[PDB]
Amino acid sequence: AAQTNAPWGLARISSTSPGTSTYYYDESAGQGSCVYVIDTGIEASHPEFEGRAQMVKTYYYSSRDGNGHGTHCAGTVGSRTYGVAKKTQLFGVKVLDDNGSGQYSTIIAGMDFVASDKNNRNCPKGVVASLSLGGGYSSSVNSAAARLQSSGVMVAVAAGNNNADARNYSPASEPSVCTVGASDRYDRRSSFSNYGSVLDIFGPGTDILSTWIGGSTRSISGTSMATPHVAGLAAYLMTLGKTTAASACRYIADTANKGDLSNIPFGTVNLLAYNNYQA
Ligand SMILES: [Ca+2]
Ligand SMILES: [Cl-]
């Protein structure tokens, strides 16, 4: 399949070179997989989700995404126009308030929730969790992310946006999950992206167009935007049978575009998520 005039990041993950405009992908499109978006919620009614999104848990007064962030990230995972895995099932877990903030105890509880809830969902191609969130180092947060991964969920987490070593951020610094840095459309490390030995992969994160609340769309930037590219790529690759929840991060690193990014500090991977699609 090919999507012409795609958001740059979608085109990027299906090209060995920057600057293209068509997103090439197998039409299975993540069908049969499920991705939990652990965030501010998801506006499931957005036409771009086509009935494939639903809220399954909230830690606030409403399940409504009153911010937009969670809807944006969900859209990069799996919306029709803006998503990597256009036929996946999306599940929203609202651990962040409508200002985009959340307490660690709440974020932990939402991870544990997914580890259990997935046992009551039909996800025959597997389960992914996208965590476009985090703050400073916390062993308890890292342990929660490790638990979610061990339970059989492909965990993708944001590296953080401090132009600093991700070793001092959580859940970014948990080794056993997939820690995602951000790049721009010219294959530079995004100006804000964290780096370091714990990063597994880069994805597009500067000026990413996706869904927003109110049935809208907008472009924003962050390692929060890179993360759902990787989560969606994992779902896509799991539906194709190429990898599993346990092995998907490693598979994505194995198959990544290598040494194409600039301003990567020595000791950080120079690896850009790539679907290696061959019509
Ligand atoms: Ca890792
Ligand atoms: Cl709910």
Side-chain angles (χ1 to χ4, degrees):
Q3 174 188 351
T4 64
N5 303 306
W8 77 264
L10 300 188
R12 190 70 193 82
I13 68 159
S14 62
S15 178
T16 57
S17 54
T20 68
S21 70
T22 298
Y23 176 36
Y24 298 102
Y25 60 99
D26 187 270
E27 61 196 296
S28 57
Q31 174 178 5
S33 68
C34 301
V35 185
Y36 288 83
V37 180
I38 306 178
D39 209 293
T40 66
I42 308 173
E43 187 176 278
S45 63
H46 200 303
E48 278 284 335
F49 299 123
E50 302 177 304
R52 296 179 292 97
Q54 64 183 292
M55 287 301 296
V56 300
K57 179 64 181 184
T58 182
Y59 297 89
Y60 298 89
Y61 312 97
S62 186
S63 60
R64 173 173 161 265
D65 181 9
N67 183 272
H69 186 271
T71 292
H72 194 276
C73 293
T76 295
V77 175
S79 66
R80 183 201 83 166
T81 304
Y82 314 103
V84 173
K86 298 178 188 303
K87 298 183 185 153
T88 195
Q89 169 76 48
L90 296 164
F91 300 130
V93 181
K94 183 175 171 62
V95 299
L96 305 180
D97 72 18
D98 290 335
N99 295 317
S101 70
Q103 289 320 287
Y104 277 172
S105 54
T106 300
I107 291 161
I108 291 161
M111 294 193 238
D112 285 329
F113 172 83
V114 173
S116 180
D117 184 71
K118 73 167 184 311
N119 304 318
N120 36 262
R121 311 283 167 191
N122 247 326
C123 302
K125 302 292 187 190
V127 187
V128 183
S130 195
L131 295 58
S132 289
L133 51 72
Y137 182 84
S138 161
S139 58
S140 297
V141 173
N142 283 4
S143 184
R147 290 190 300 276
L148 180 57
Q149 180 70 47
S150 174
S151 85
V153 177
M154 191 287 176
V155 182
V157 312
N161 307 315
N162 324 93
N163 186 33
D165 198 304
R167 72 189 308 151
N168 294 322
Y169 297 90
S170 289
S173 61
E174 169 48 37
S176 70
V177 299
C178 206
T179 300
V180 183
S183 62
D184 76 15
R185 71 170 76 226
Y186 292 105
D187 283 351
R188 302 181 269 238
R189 176 173 66 89
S190 300
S191 71
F192 57 80
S193 185
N194 286 355
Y195 52 83
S197 65
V198 70
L199 267 65
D200 298 283
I201 194 63
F202 285 81
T206 300
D207 296 337
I208 307 302
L209 178 62
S210 191
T211 41
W212 200 257
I213 56 167
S216 72
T217 63
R218 63 179 61 187
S219 184
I220 57 164
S221 300
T223 57
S224 293
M225 289 58 263
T227 299
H229 285 86
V230 168
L233 177 62
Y236 167 91
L237 292 170
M238 289 160 62
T239 285
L240 286 164
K242 290 181 196 288
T243 189
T244 73
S247 56
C249 191
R250 192 171 327 260
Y251 179 90
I252 290 165
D254 285 351
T255 58
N257 284 312
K258 201 166 203 153
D260 298 321
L261 303 170
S262 69
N263 205 30
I264 299 293
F266 196 90
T268 293
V269 293
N270 196 331
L271 299 173
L272 181 66
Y274 175 52
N275 71 0
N276 201 18
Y277 176 61
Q278 306 301 319

Coordinates of all heavy atoms in Angstrom, one line a residue, residues 55-58 63 92, ligand 2:
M55 N -11.5 4.1 25.1 CA -11.0 4.3 26.4 C -11.3 3.1 27.3 O -12.4 2.5 27.2 CB -11.6 5.5 27.1 CG -11.1 6.8 26.6 SD -9.3 7.1 26.7 CE -9.1 7.1 28.5
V56 N -10.3 2.6 28.0 CA -10.5 1.4 28.9 C -10.2 1.7 30.3 O -10.6 0.9 31.2 CB -9.7 0.2 28.4 CG1 -10.0 -0.2 27.0 CG2 -8.2 0.5 28.5
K57 N -9.6 2.8 30.7 CA -9.3 3.2 32.1 C -9.0 4.6 32.2 O -8.2 5.2 31.4 CB -8.1 2.4 32.6 CG -7.7 2.6 34.0 CD -8.7 2.2 35.0 CE -8.3 2.4 36.5 NZ -9.3 1.9 37.4
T58 N -9.5 5.3 33.3 CA -9.1 6.6 33.6 C -8.8 6.7 35.1 O -9.4 6.0 35.9 CB -10.1 7.7 33.2 OG1 -9.6 8.9 33.6 CG2 -11.5 7.4 33.8
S63 N -13.0 10.1 31.5 CA -12.1 9.5 30.6 C -11.8 10.3 29.4 O -11.0 10.0 28.5 CB -12.8 8.2 30.0 OG -14.0 8.5 29.4
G92 N -7.1 3.4 25.3 CA -6.7 4.6 26.0 C -6.7 4.3 27.5 O -7.7 3.9 28.1
Ligands
CL2 CL -12.6 4.5 30.7

